[PDB]
Design a protein around this ligand. Structure first.
Ligand SMILES: [Mg+2]
Ligand SMILES: [Zn+2]
Ligand SMILES: [Zn+2]
Lengths: 43, 65, 392, 263, 49, 114, 30, 56, 147, 133, 181
RNA sequence: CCAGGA
């Protein structure tokens, strides 16, 4: 329930990769495997 | 929620020991490790039963009907 | 998916209790199945004709040697592979009691108790000896590994004469889905029905033996010697300087680029090369310091699971992290993270994970490993559909 | 005296520490297995629920009632309902327990194994009494009720073994060790520097002679002398866990001899 | 323990999933690829608050 | 759901004998006893005692699959000696050994004051 | 000594306060 | 592609797989429930007549 | 699964007597394969266990927090203080024979999770059943008794 | 049915490279200079140190299954301290009148180098190895 | 955390002092000094990604503040506080993690994706979801009979209510080869 | 579509 209220969607350069700018803002591990991998960010 | 009767791993009754444990902590101020051991809970399988219990029942009772 | 003729094979029914489809472990590989929550499909023929088609063309034993790579596509795995090495060491001797159970366990056993390799003081049988009961007569095999003599001092290679092991330890090269394999020879020499029986046989003996011998794996198996850890730390330490030395050399404009490369491209190549040379040295240090009693080494030795790098990364040093081939780049203006100074080309800044998994990762190491880790998950995800359509 | 011998080290209501010498490991183990699995006990097996206003599920409670230990001293004079001649249960084959509880108190009202009452005729045999080892004399805490929280149910306790359900397990952990100095070479000690320094010495080391390095390996040597500890749950007294265990295994063997006899 | 942050719509609990987008009113320069008449572009996605 | 009844472990099936003695074809004076609704508890016990018998040439047992409570025990004896008799004696020896064990425990327990 | 530098365990006392105030769905609510 | 090259089919069954060291290479453990659902149409013949009558 | 991406289904359930046991009388609730650990490199799983073993004996909350000064050596020392062998190994005896295992088993508590995927909600079989109207072919999904 | 080789050797070296219960032993015949011996032995059962004089015998006998006891009344063809049973696997022609025979006692390997026993040793599953002193 | 060169006595030091810390734990015992109190007293600040570009952060305060004027081998290899420029300090580096990853014990000892896997599986782990389960009509509800708090825990779980509402049980686990099942 | 499983 908690992790669902902190979920981020990104619709449509290399978006799936974990960017340096994601430090402290988004979880480096919590992302799906497959299709949505790295397009569903968790705060 | 609500103390397990019998330790899963060996089946030593652990159902009686709950209040007694909670008492050896408030009333006796004793640390968890001594209270468990006082209560004769020697094997870690038995220890984990009480030590890691979450008595959710007490919250459940807070609702009226 | 079903990207194979072996992804659909004909099996004999065995009605059993409990809600799961049970399969023999050696048939795992062709299907590409595991038991982490995989489901499988079952189709029932309705005609005498259809049944014949299944039994006569696509039955599991027929499918053992595949035309894909002209070699066996099923071999001995996991417990049975791990236990097979353990059983077949010179050190390994079995007392009468257990020999009788191990023998009875073989469903086609002649009823003949083999003469013990040691007759007094105390009758004792070897692993090699009692495994050879599963090996059918007429089966001839010879293999020379690095340093194999007819005296096989290191219990190297393999020598099976008339379906009886003479020397060497049984493992992946012998009993796996290998080109020269005990399986390849058996299917070819004795038949698919005979070879299929051999799988069951080898496993019934091995699994039984290992049930009673036992086998585990702990943190103690990742732990490396006190001085080996000093020696590892001082391996990274010297490589860290070697890198600073090339950096100081590049900052002083003395560096001379390799024909067809940027002065910078040339530098990064060197840095990356030293740091890897290092991770491997540090690894090969631990790998050597771990005794044969190391449960991880034991699994790696049999070929049941794990490789060199796994020991290296766990015991000694994780190593350099890459994204798009290059080290962690400057996502922030002239730096990888806000905890660093600008224009920092140091190993620590561009993603070199100095520590072992046993030691733990620093927040910086943790995030860089996370970036590098995410890259693989992305291709795993994508490749999956690209690869699918290629097949079609 | 005769064949295998016992030498008790410590005794209580709950524990038996002893030494079993002049025995086959196979025998020591087979006894150990039987004590865990095949000794009969009485335990709640059917729970008819008339009312439940509790925060807990009918079956959640039901499950617990089975795990409550019951006096199984005279378990041997009770029949297994399966073997009994009635329709379901009777006196010759069961113990009927009753439990009526209500939150009269503004404070939380507790439900204990003591709150169980026998309604069936006992035929004057030591059976079905909820085992109370509790200092305050309450036994097992079954439930907690608030105000209008009522729990009205009926229990049918039946003779059974741990093979059918672990509730009929009269024994807790059974400790079992042999050869505290690895004289038999039955284990290859995993180590980093020294197996002697790294691995803790057993209690039982004191009850055996250390090997003394300047001696060859005794291959002829065999496993006899077993340091065991039998822990009771309550249903049967510690001694009777051992005795009844010995007897069950004996009866189990007799059946085979008899089977051969009928053949 | 229930934290809120959700809505109840015709019985069911609905979460408004945060939607990632690029910030507007932002000057960005990009090199337009090898086969192109235009070599570089300055873009501004201008929009009102 | 596809779960077998728990009593199936110990309670004999409809028309199912505890013992089924079949003769071994591959070896002279050898037999195979299948024990229904039995486990290691009895198998390993009997096997180990037959090992003590000098006139017993071969003895081993196996639980062919864990979903089923049954085990096959193979007995081979010297010519003239019957394997059924071998099994009979080992069974007896076990009982007599257990009888003493009980007697010895009882005596020792009665001596304790706890 | 109320002006003494903070230790590493003390960072949790700040984190405690962050959550005491904001909670876990701060963003959704705000 | 969806109704002709591929088809949904009868006499099909699906469940979670698990391993077994006691099954023979070529066999497959089939849950009783699955066996009790899936059927083979056997023709009544002098050879099977009695057996078949019994399963009936 | 554990909290280390170490997932799996139950292969068999064994009673206490069949299970391997410590001399102390302790038995596992779960037996997981050594073959998981190496390829996967889930070191924290092994540490979780060691620490949880100490925690269970000590009656103190085992701090498994990320960036800390807790070492596998630190925990090892504490476990030796409790009488167990420092690296979590324990000698086990085979359940069927009672004979000591030649190997010593890495044994201790580990937090395991029960996941939403249960065999009985998955199992499905069909042999003639409902058909679609248009295509006159087997209907879709377990739910609809599809093929 | 009879003996095939007999000589007393003296152990030069004993080697347990990683092996805890087994050792490769290097010996030479005290009688014949031409004669040498390489052999894996269960040193946990019958210990061997260097400079030990050992009587090493072959013999093709004393077929079908194996029987355990009764050996009390039976003629223990062992006047020796450690006995093995293995298979002859190779016949190396090491120049001149010199020969070398390879024996595997269920993995425990043996290499005997000499000359004379042309009229003795054979490529047979049947070959016992007897050792005393 | 804000760090200032501003300190009469010595070097560049983190605004927040042991006095504020006790001033907060006083309010922690009361259940007057909130998070807002640290924010208005300019001890702590809010930094977005664009602003992050111009700052310089220390990971640990104490470990990354006073310079050097034997060493434990078991601990991981750490860098230094070479910077005299430090504008800010990290409250706690573990805070880079989201709700799911914050239940992973020792995630610094696992291979990168194994962590990514757990933060996906725990979402499918059974347990008590809310204490009011008995009063709500939802399609499907799965509740664990006897939930247990974990023996190995994260300092971050305190805030995640995990020990109060767990997702599993501490099982006695042997890593062994047994029947091959 | 949405959410998930190998
Ligand atoms: Mg899988
Ligand atoms: Zn216990
Ligand atoms: Zn009755």
């Amino acid at each position: 329930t908690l992790s669902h209220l902190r979920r981020t969607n990104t619709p449509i350069a290399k978006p799936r990769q974990l960017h340096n700018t994601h430090w402290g803002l988004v979880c480096p591990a919590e992302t799906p495997e497959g299709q949505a991998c790295g397009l569903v960010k968790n705060l | 929620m609500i103390v397990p009767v019998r330790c899963f791993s060996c089946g030593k009754v652990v159902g009686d020991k709950w209040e007694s444990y909670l008492n050896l902590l408030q009333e006796d101020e004793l640390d968890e490790g001594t209270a468990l051991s006082r209560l004769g809970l020697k094997r870690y399988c038995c220890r984990r039963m009480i030590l890691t219990h979450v008595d959710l029942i007490e919250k459940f009772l807070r609702y009226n009907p | 998916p079903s990207l194979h003729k072996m992804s659909m094979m004909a099996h004999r029914v065995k009605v059993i209790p409990y809600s799961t489809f049970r399969l023999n472990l050696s048939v795992t590989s062709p299907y590409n199945a595991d038991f982490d929550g995989d489901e499988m499909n079952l189709h029932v023929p309705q005609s005498e004709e259809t049944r014949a088609e299944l039994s006569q063309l696509c039955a599991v034993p027929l499918q053992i040697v595949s035309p894909q790579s002209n070699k066996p596509c099923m071999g001995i795995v996991q417990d049975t592979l791990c236990g097979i090495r353990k059983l077949t060491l010179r050190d390994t001797f079995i007392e009468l009691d257990q020999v009788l159970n191990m023998l009875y366990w073989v469903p086609d056993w002649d009823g003949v108790i083999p003469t013990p390799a040691i007759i007094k003081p105390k009758p004792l049988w070897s692993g090699k000896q009692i495994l050879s009961v599963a090996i059918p007569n007429g089966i001839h095999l010879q293999r020379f590994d690095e340093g194999t003599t007819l005296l096989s001092p290191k219990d190297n290679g393999m020598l099976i004469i008339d379906g009886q092991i003479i020397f060497g330890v049984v493992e992946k090269k012998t009993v796996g889905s290998s080109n020269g394999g005990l399986i390849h020879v058996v299917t070819r020499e004795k038949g698919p029905q005979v070879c299929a029986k051999l799988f069951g046989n080898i496993q019934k003996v091995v699994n039984f033996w290992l049930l009673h011998n036992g086998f585990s794996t702990g943190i103690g198996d990742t732990i490396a010697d006190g001085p080996t850890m000093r020696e590892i730390t001082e391996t990274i330490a010297e490589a860290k300087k070697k890198v600073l030395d090339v950096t100081k050399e590049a900052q002083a404009n003395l560096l001379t680029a390799k024909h067809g490369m940027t002065l910078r491209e040339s530098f990064e190549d060197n840095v990356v090369r030293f740091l890897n040379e290092a991770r491997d040295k540090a690894g090969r240090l631990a790998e050597v310091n771990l005794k044969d009693l190391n449960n991880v080494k034991q699994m790696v030795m049999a070929g049941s699971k794990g490789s060199f790098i796994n020991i290296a990364q766990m015991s000694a040093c994780v190593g350099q992290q890459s994204v798009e081939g290059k080290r962690i780049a400057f996502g922030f203006v002239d730096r990888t993270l806000p905890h660093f100074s600008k224009d920092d080309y140091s190993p620590e800044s561009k993603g070199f994970v100095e520590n072992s998994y046993l030691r733990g990762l620093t927040p910086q190491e943790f995030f860089f490993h996370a970036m590098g880790g995410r890259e693989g998950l992305i291709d795993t995800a994508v490749k999956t559909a690209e690869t699918g359509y290629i097949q079609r | 005296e005769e064949g295998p011998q016992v030498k008790i080290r410590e005794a209580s209501k709950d524990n038996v520490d002893f030494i079993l010498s002049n025995v086959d490991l196979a025998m020591a183990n087979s006894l150990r297995r039987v004590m865990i699995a095949e000794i009969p006990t009485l335990a709640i097996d059917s729970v008819e629920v008339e009312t439940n206003t509790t925060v807990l599920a009918d079956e959640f409670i039901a499950h617990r009632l089975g795990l409550i230990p019951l006096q199984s001293m005279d378990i041997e004079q009770l029949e297994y309902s399966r073997d009994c001649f009635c329709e379901d249960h009777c006196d010759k084959c069961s113990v009927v327990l009753t439990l009526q509880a209500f939150g009269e108190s503004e404070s939380t009202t507790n439900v204990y194994s003591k709150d169980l009452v026998i309604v069936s005729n006992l035929m004057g045999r030591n059976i079905g009494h909820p085992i109370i080892q509790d200092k305050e004399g309450n036994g097992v805490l079954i439930c907690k009720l608030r105000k209008g929280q009522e729990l009205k149910l009926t229990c049918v306790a039946k003779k059974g073994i741990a093979k059918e359900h672990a509730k009929w397990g009269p024994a807790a952990a059974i400790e079992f060790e042999y050869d505290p100095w690895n004289k038999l070479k039955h284990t290859d000690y995993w180590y980093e520097q020294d197996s002697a320094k790294e691995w803790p010495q057993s209690k039982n080391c004191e009850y055996e002679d250390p090997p003394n390095e300047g001696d060859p390996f005794d291959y002829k040597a065999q496993a006899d002398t077993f340091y065991m500890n039998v822990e009771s749950v309550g249903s049967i007294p510690v001694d009777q866990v051992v005795v009844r265990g010995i007897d069950t295994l004996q009866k189990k063997v007799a059946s085979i001899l008899l089977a051969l006899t009928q053949m | 323990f229930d934290m809120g942050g959700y809505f109840i719509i015709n019985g069911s609990e609905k979460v408004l999933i945060a939607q990632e987008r690029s910030a507007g009113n932002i000057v960005q320069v990009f090199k337009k690829a090898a086969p192109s008449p235009i070599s570089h572009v300055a873009e501004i996605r201008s929009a009102l608050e | 759901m596809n779960a077998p009844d728990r009593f199936e472990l110990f309670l004999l099936g409809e028309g199912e004998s505890k013992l089924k003695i079949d003769p071994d074809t591959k070896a002279p004076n050898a037999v195979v006893i299948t024990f229904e609704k039995e486990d290691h508890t009895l198998g390993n016990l009997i096997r180990a005692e037959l090992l003590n018998d000098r006139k017993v040439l071969f003895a081993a047992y196996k639980v062919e699959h864990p979903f089923f409570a049954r085990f096959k025990l193979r007995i081979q004896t010297t010519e003239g000696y019957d394997p059924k008799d071998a099994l009979k004696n080992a069974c007896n020896s076990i009982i007599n050994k257990l009888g003493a064990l009980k007697t010895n425990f009882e005596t020792e327990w009665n001596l304790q004051t706890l | 000594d109320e002006s003494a530098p903070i230790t590493a365990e003390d960072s949790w006392a700040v984190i405690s306060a962050f959550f005491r105030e904001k909670g876990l769905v701060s963003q959704q609510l705000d | 592609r969806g109704n002709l090259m591929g088809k949904r089919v009868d006499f099909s069954a699906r469940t979670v797989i698990s391993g077994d060291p006691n099954l023979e290479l070529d066999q497959v453990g089939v849950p009783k429930s699955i066996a009790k659902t899936l059927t083979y149409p056997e023709v009544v013949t002098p050879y099977n007549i009695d057996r078949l009558t019994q399963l009936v | 699964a554990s909290r280390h991406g170490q997932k799996g289904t139950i292969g068999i359930t064994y009673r206490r007597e069949d299970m391997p046991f410590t001399a102390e009388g302790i038995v596992p609730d779960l037996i997981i394969n050594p073959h998981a650990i190496p390829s996967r490199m889930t070191v924290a799983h092994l540490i979780e266990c060691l620490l949880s073993k100490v925690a269970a004996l000590s009656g103190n909350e085992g701090d498994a927090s990320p960036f800390t000064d807790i070492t596998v050596e630190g925990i090892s020392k504490l476990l030796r203080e409790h009488g167990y062998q420092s690296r979590g190994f324990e000698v086990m005896y085979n359940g069927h024979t009672g004979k000591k295992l030649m190997a010593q088993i890495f044994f201790g508590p580990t937090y395991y999770q029960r996941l939403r995927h249960m065999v009985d909600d998955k199992i499905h079989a069909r042999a003639r059943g409902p058909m679609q109207v248009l295509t006159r072919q087997p209907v879709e999904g377990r739910s609809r008794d599809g093929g | 049915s009879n003996t095939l080789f007999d000589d007393i050797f003296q152990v030069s070296e004993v080697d347990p490279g990683r092996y805890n219960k087994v050792c490769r032993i290097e010996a030479a015949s005290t009688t014949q200079d031409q004669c040498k011996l390489t052999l894996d032995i269960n040193v946990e059962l019958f210990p061997v140190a260097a400079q030990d004089s050992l009587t090493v015998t072959i013999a093709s006998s004393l077929t079908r299954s194996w029987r355990p006891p009764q050996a009390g009344d039976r003629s223990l063809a062992d006047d020796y301290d450690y006995v093995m049973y293995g298979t002859a696997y190779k016949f190396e022609e090491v120049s001149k009148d010199l020969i070398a025979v390879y024996y595997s006692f269920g993995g425990l390997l043996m290499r005997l180098e000499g000359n004379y026993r042309n009229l003795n040793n054979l490529k047979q599953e049947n070959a016992y190895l007897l050792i005393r002193r | 955390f804000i760090v200032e060169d501003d300190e009469s006595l010595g070097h560049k030091e983190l605004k927040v002092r042991k006095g504020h810390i006790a001033k907060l734990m006083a309010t922690e015992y009361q259940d007057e000094y909130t998070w807002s109190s640290l924010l208005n007293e300019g001890l702590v600040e809010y930094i977005d990604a664009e602003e992050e570009e111009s700052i310089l952060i220390a990971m640990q305060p104490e470990d990354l503040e006073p310079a050097e004027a034997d060493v434990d081998p078991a601990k991981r290899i750490r860098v230094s506080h070479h910077a005299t420029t430090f504008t800010h300090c990290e409250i706690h580096p573990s805070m880079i993690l989201g709700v799911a990853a914050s239940i992973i014990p020792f995630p610094d000892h696992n291979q990168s994706p194994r962590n990514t896997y757990q933060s996906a599986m725990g979402k499918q782990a059974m347990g008590v979801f809310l204490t009011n389960y008995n009063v709500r009509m939802d399609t499907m509800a799965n509740i664990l009979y006897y939930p247990q708090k974990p023996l190995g825990t994260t300092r971050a779980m305190e805030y995640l209510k995990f020990r109060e509402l767990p997702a599993g049980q501490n099982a006695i686990v042997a890593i062994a080869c047994y029947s091959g099942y």
